[PDB]
Amino acid sequence: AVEVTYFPFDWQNCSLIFRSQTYNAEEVEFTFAVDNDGKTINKIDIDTEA
Amino acid sequence: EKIWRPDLVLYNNADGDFAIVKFTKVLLQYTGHITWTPPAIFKSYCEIIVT
Numbered sequence: 001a002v003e004v005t006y007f008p009f010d011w012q013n014c015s016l017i018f019r020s021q022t023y024n025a026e027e028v029e030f031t032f033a034v035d036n037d038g039k040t041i042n043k044i045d046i047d048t049e050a
Numbered sequence: 051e052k053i054w055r056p057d058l059v060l061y062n063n064a065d066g067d068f069a070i071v072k073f074t075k076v077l078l079q080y081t082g083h084i085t086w087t088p089p090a091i092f093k094s095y096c097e098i099i100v101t
């Protein structure tokens with residue numbers, strides 16, 4: 001949903017929501033992957049090569 | 051796709067799909083109860099009054 005108020009000098013908040021289509025939380029759960037240092041990557045990963 | 055299902059159709063479909071095309075998995079309980087919650091995009095005719 002686009003907040004138009006300050007368009008074209010605007011900033012947006014776009015969601016990406018991922019879930020299992022079949023399984024509930026008791027059957028399949030999620031955790032964030034950890035980096036080479038063991039730090040939780042709780043964000044969209046950005047590889048500079050790609 | 052492996053089981054009998056009701057053949058639900060959107061009777062007032064305008065130009066989209068008439069029935070479910072996304073055949074997601076069903077949850078089957080030991081009592082024989084089945085829950086099936088497919089997604090769909092419904093394109094339905096609606097008489098628009100523009101007065």
Ligand SMILES: *[C@@H]1O[C@H](CO)[C@@H](O[C@@H]2O[C@H](CO)[C@@H](O[C@@H]3O[C@H](CO[C@H]4O[C@H](CO)[C@@H](O)[C@H](O)[C@@H]4O)[C@@H](O)[C@H](O[C@H]4O[C@H](CO)[C@@H](O)[C@H](O)[C@@H]4O)[C@@H]3O)[C@H](O)[C@H]2NC(C)=O)[C@H](O)[C@H]1NC(C)=O
Binds near residue numbers: 013015
């Ligand atoms: C970009 O968009 C995202 C998603 O919309 C925003 O993140 C959400 O922000 C809202 C606040 O605007 C968060 O909602 C708040 O969550 C607080 C924590 O409770 C939640 O988490 C616990 C975890 O155990 C749950 O049990 C609980 O049910 C909640 O899910 C609440 O304390 C806040 O309560 C306030 O609002 C409610 C009404 O909504 C009132 O009833 C309360 O009294 C109180 O005033 C609130 O619900 C939401 O959790 C965030 N989602 C996330 C982070 O995933 C970003 O903030 C946004 N970024 C921007 C705009 O910069």
